[PDB]
Amino acid sequence: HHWGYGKHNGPEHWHKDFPIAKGERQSPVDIDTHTAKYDPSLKPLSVSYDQATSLRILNNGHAFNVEFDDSQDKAVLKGGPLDGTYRLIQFHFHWGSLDGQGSEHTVDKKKYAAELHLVHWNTKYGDFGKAVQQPDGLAVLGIFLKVGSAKPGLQKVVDVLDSIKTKGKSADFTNFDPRGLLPESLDYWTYPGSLTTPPLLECVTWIVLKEPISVSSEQVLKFRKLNFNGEGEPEELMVDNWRPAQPLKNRQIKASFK
Ligand SMILES: CN1CCN(C(=O)c2ccc(S(N)(=O)=O)cc2)C[C@@H]1Cc1ccccc1
Ligand SMILES: [Zn+2]
């Protein structure tokens, strides 16, 4: 009876195995755009993905992860609110059963069709497993997806999903360039939070881009053909793999822009 996104094991149940679910810096949150304060001391974000080495794509039963070689400073996130150098380890998405839901963060209570999480760890902690034990261990770059025009740099991801339909399937996924998933603007909101899945560790500096990317209805439909289940198990479509907004509590969301 493991955690997931069903009626019996979904987000309202997680606190029983992961009591930090009710903690003081849980993610995601609603971004109230009128209350977020411009912080003119925030620096521009530095996204340095030119030497990124993608390796593999994995259906983990909760989402799919595009994994990178993080054994050197190849694809890194710096600046913005961050002190030091954060290495890209993987990206994944959260999405809905319908275009009107799927994002984890909301903006003035608006839900987007999906949300991309580019996950990075602070190199001062040496490995990802050590970093998630620290309050400044991770930086997750969050990008909203809306349905409209296709995102050409997403199609190589969409086209491999048939090969990883079920939990535990992986596929080679070399030479994928995550720069093709970014919007034009790097304007962002930032706040201290958590992993949005168990173990819900309070180790993330969230950086949420204001500008969503557009994907096509056909691209997101292909996300919704994935399976939560393993091969030869009853089919349960991988949809609505998002945690809803959690209480902001004693936190301030800062804006990089006016
Ligand atoms: C390493 N795994 C397995 C997968 N996972 C994560 O690494 C992770 C990353 C990003 C997010 S998010 N949606 O961007 O906030 C959520 C979870 C969870 C988990 C983390 C973990 C940490 C310590 C002990 C055991 C497991
Ligand atoms: Zn995520």
C-alpha 73 – ligand 1 centre gap (Å): 21
> Is 52 strand, coil or helix?
coil
Helices marked H in the chain — which ranges?
A: 128-131, 155-160, 217-223
Measured between its terminal Cα atoms, the distance across the chain in Å is 47
| Ligand 1 pocket, residues with Cβ under 6 angstroms | 117, 119, 132, 140, 195-197, 199, 201
Map out the domains of the chain as residue ranges: 1-258
Distance of alpha carbon 18 from alpha carbon 8, whole angstroms: 15
**Binding site feature residues for substrate:** 196-197
Q: If residue 55 lies in a helix (H) or strand (E), which one and from where to where?
A: strand 54-59
Residues, CB-to-ion distance under 5 Å, ligand 2: 117
* Nearest atom within ligand 1 for CA of residue 197: 16
Q: For ligand 1, pick from 3, 26, 64, 197 the residue to mutate: most ligand atoms within 8 Å of CB.
A: 197
Give the active site residues: 62
Closest ligand to C-alpha of residue 58 is 1
CA separation (Å) from 219 to 38, 132, 201? 34, 32, 31
Token pair for 139: 């930086």
Distance of alpha carbon 74 from alpha carbon 24, whole angstroms: 33
